[PDB]
Amino acid sequence: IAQARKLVEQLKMEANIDRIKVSKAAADLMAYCEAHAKEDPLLTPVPASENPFR
Amino acid sequence: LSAEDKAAVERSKMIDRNLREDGEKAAREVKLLLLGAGESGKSTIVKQMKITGIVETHFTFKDLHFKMFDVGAQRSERKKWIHCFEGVTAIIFCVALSDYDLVNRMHESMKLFDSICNNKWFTDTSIILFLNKKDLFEEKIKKSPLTICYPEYAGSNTYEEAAAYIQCQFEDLNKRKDTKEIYTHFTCSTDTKNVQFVFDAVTDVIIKNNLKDCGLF
Amino acid sequence: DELRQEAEQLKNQIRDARKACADATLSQITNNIDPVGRIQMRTRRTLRGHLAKIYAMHWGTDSRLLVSASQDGKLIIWDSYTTNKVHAIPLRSSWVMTCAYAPSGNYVACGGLDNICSIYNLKTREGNVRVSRELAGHTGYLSCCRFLDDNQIVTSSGDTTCALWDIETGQQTTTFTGHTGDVMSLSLAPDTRLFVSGACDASAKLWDVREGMCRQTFTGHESDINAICFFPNGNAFATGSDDATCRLFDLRADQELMTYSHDNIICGITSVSFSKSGRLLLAGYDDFNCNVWDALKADRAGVLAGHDNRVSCLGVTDDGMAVATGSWDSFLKIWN
Amino acid sequence: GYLFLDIITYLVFAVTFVLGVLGNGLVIWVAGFRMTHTVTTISYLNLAVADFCFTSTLPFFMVRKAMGGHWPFGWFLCKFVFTIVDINLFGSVFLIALIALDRCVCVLHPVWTQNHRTVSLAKKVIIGPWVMALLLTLPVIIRVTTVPGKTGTVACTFNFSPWTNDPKERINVAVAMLTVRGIIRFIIGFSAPMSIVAVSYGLIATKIHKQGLIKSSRPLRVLSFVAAAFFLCWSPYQVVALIATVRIRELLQGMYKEIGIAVDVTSALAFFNSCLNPMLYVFMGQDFRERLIHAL
Amino acid sequence: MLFII
Ligand SMILES: CCCCCCCCCCCCCCCC(=O)O
Ligand SMILES: CCCCCCCCCCCCCCCC(=O)O
């Protein structure tokens, strides 16, 4: 029965968490993807003179 | 083209030759998974073989080297690690015959047997099946009726008929009756009889595997 | 007796809090962005030499070396640029479901049905690789293990417990209890202060490594969770499940943002990894081929076939140059 | 009256060339490149190259029969074609014997095939059929030559001891050399491989019937459809060849015109086995059948 | 194999 009270305590901290709007989180993920897009060899093919796997 | 990494390629080739030699020495050994239903029996058939994690028992019979993976210590979701044993030659499944009265234990053993026999990974893997404690079964069936576990059983409560009925119920759980054969055995105290049965069953499985590979079967 | 209704009320409250914070979906905000959906990756190397199913691979921070584990009992460290095998480590137990390569590169770890995480010292005065410490304290199998540094390794297990270990002492410094089902995967935050563990109970829990209490719990998967990987920010993570669905959970928003599903895909996901920018989600399905999900739009940007059996493990290099997918076919392929 | 026996020969060569090159190619491509190398598949690859190079060599035979024995290609091309044909045919027979012995050893003695039947031993063994094929093809390589004809035609007939130009001695020398080739044909290329195939496919059929391990008759059916096919394709030619090699003196003057067409039609039946080996070893295996459709 | 004559 200790598991039940322990789950109740854990679900208390999950409850009081300073959350942010999903719009802000989505904007942050989109902003990071745009910022690091150039330094990402997978999104845009890299020239063979710069690619170490040939 | 290669200057100081030529020796690196030489090391790569040397350790690849060592990987192949070890791989041949691993494929040489026949791998058996021992998915015992209960601690009972599973321990007994392990002692009857020549000799915390998963116990890997190594033994050799008639120039055939065996590996028995006693995975009973792995009490977790079998679905998430059962695919690790997809290529075992046979699944030695150990059942205690004297578990019908104990508690429903035999019903649990059948549930596990159905779970592994009709598994998506062991469709073509022969299941050796040991029905253990036949001695305790012989004494038990005298006083405790087998109708406790099987209401449908309609036969004289004698060891031969009752044991045959239990073997029939276990052997009837396989929906795939073509790609798999359930080699069943009532365990004899002699260590030689139990190992010989495993050797005979695995030689049959090796012959069938060769037939399937060669295209005959 | 009262605890059960209190827990149900708290679950309703947290669900209401998440619904309140979900002002808009990820798809609505990122509907106007460029659909980067032309992803063709040719296999640039085929690392061969494993004679059994490959269950785990991990890249080095140098993004050149990678350690791969397989059921023939061998950890092989590959110089992926030249396909050479730097080391071949004969494991004590062939049943290895996971492997990790230390960020420093000095050590490798591997564990599985043995319940033990073995730490191997690659750089020794002698020429052989020797096991430094066997971390034996788990009752359930080892599904994942990730090095935090040369001394701290976090290990998810199949007994519902994720553990934090001190390698020199060999004893758990923290046990992350709380999952109700077997934990199948781990993902360390880029800053190494947080790590998300996905379990068979379809719940992914964010944990804090410093004190060891579950910071957040994420649900939304129908079936078992097989793979998890933090977004390069560490403020989001993708999860791979047996229900043929990846989901992107954001840590701050504390709720699922995007669902990565396609009707023709009805097979479980065995591995998940993000691209260097996080714009690509590399999900390794068990339909024998990986997929490339555009993480911001949930449109399948590409496919990485070339593997005969299921893609068991997948990893993107720390510089994002290559994606090494290892499969039960005994062959690791590096893609670019 | 005998013109009919020629068109069937031309078609049997024609069907063998096209079906053989396409089918064996499939075996080489799928087994060699698409599939992993197991002992059984490498044995099939060896048989596939053995009966593929020979079928590729067949157009030379069709044209030679077309021009009444004229070999217009030259000297090197006759040396290479006849050398390749004998290496391959002798191999396309020793490898069938080796596959039969492999299927026999992997059923009669399963413990040995588990412990020692590895790809390493298999590749060591697969040279033995090729090495035997090359050593028994040396009479072709060291004696076969384009020989001029006073009739306005050129022929690929074996020339022995060109050192002795005695018309009488040449016939006497040839009868002897060709008898040796004949005995080696009916005691190494037919009797020994037929004996190995018959003993192997009889012993495995006997075991799988006594053990009762099989459920379907498909193993017995495949063993019969392979052993009988090998016997049906090669028994005609090896039989005619033996009667010819016991009547060679009379054949070297052209007197026995009949064997001339007997050797021709029956040899086409012997060559038919080379095209049907891919039809009968790899495409009756579902693993290969699935792999081929999925390969494209 | 082949009967050249
Ligand atoms: C066509 C004639 C038959 C094929 C040629 C011979 C086949 C090989 C026979 C010997 C195989 C190896 C025997 C020793 C094996 C061992 O080391 O245990
Ligand atoms: C211990 C006694 C063993 C007796 C039988 C040994 C048989 C050896 C010959 C095996 C031939 C086939 C082996 C694989 C070769 C191949 O097919 O490529």
PDB file of C-alpha atoms in Angstrom, chain B residues 91 113-119 121-128 174-183 208 212 217, chain D residues 215:
ATOM      1  CA  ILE B  91      13.476 -24.984 -26.231  1.00  0.00           C
ATOM      2  CA  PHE B 113       3.848 -23.205 -22.869  1.00  0.00           C
ATOM      3  CA  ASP B 114       1.217 -21.651 -25.174  1.00  0.00           C
ATOM      4  CA  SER B 115       2.994 -18.295 -24.820  1.00  0.00           C
ATOM      5  CA  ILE B 116       6.344 -19.698 -26.057  1.00  0.00           C
ATOM      6  CA  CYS B 117       5.051 -22.405 -28.464  1.00  0.00           C
ATOM      7  CA  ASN B 118       2.858 -20.097 -30.607  1.00  0.00           C
ATOM      8  CA  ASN B 119       5.425 -17.256 -30.276  1.00  0.00           C
ATOM      9  CA  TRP B 121       9.966 -16.041 -32.852  1.00  0.00           C
ATOM     10  CA  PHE B 122       9.765 -19.816 -32.260  1.00  0.00           C
ATOM     11  CA  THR B 123       7.487 -20.733 -35.190  1.00  0.00           C
ATOM     12  CA  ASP B 124       9.984 -23.343 -36.472  1.00  0.00           C
ATOM     13  CA  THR B 125      11.851 -24.084 -33.197  1.00  0.00           C
ATOM     14  CA  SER B 126      11.212 -27.610 -31.871  1.00  0.00           C
ATOM     15  CA  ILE B 127      10.200 -27.646 -28.191  1.00  0.00           C
ATOM     16  CA  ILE B 128      11.615 -30.509 -26.140  1.00  0.00           C
ATOM     17  CA  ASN B 174       0.730 -25.935 -30.794  1.00  0.00           C
ATOM     18  CA  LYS B 175      -1.347 -24.370 -33.604  1.00  0.00           C
ATOM     19  CA  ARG B 176       1.705 -24.812 -35.879  1.00  0.00           C
ATOM     20  CA  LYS B 177       1.753 -28.647 -36.033  1.00  0.00           C
ATOM     21  CA  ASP B 178       3.888 -28.749 -39.217  1.00  0.00           C
ATOM     22  CA  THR B 179       7.044 -26.637 -38.658  1.00  0.00           C
ATOM     23  CA  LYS B 180       7.434 -27.749 -35.030  1.00  0.00           C
ATOM     24  CA  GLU B 181       7.496 -31.053 -33.144  1.00  0.00           C
ATOM     25  CA  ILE B 182       7.068 -31.214 -29.341  1.00  0.00           C
ATOM     26  CA  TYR B 183       9.436 -33.997 -28.283  1.00  0.00           C
ATOM     27  CA  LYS B 208      15.321 -31.272 -40.158  1.00  0.00           C
ATOM     28  CA  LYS B 212      15.125 -27.237 -44.905  1.00  0.00           C
ATOM     29  CA  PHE B 217      12.034 -30.252 -46.690  1.00  0.00           C
TER      30      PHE B 217
ATOM     31  CA  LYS D 215       5.699 -35.269 -42.948  1.00  0.00           C
TER      32      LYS D 215
END
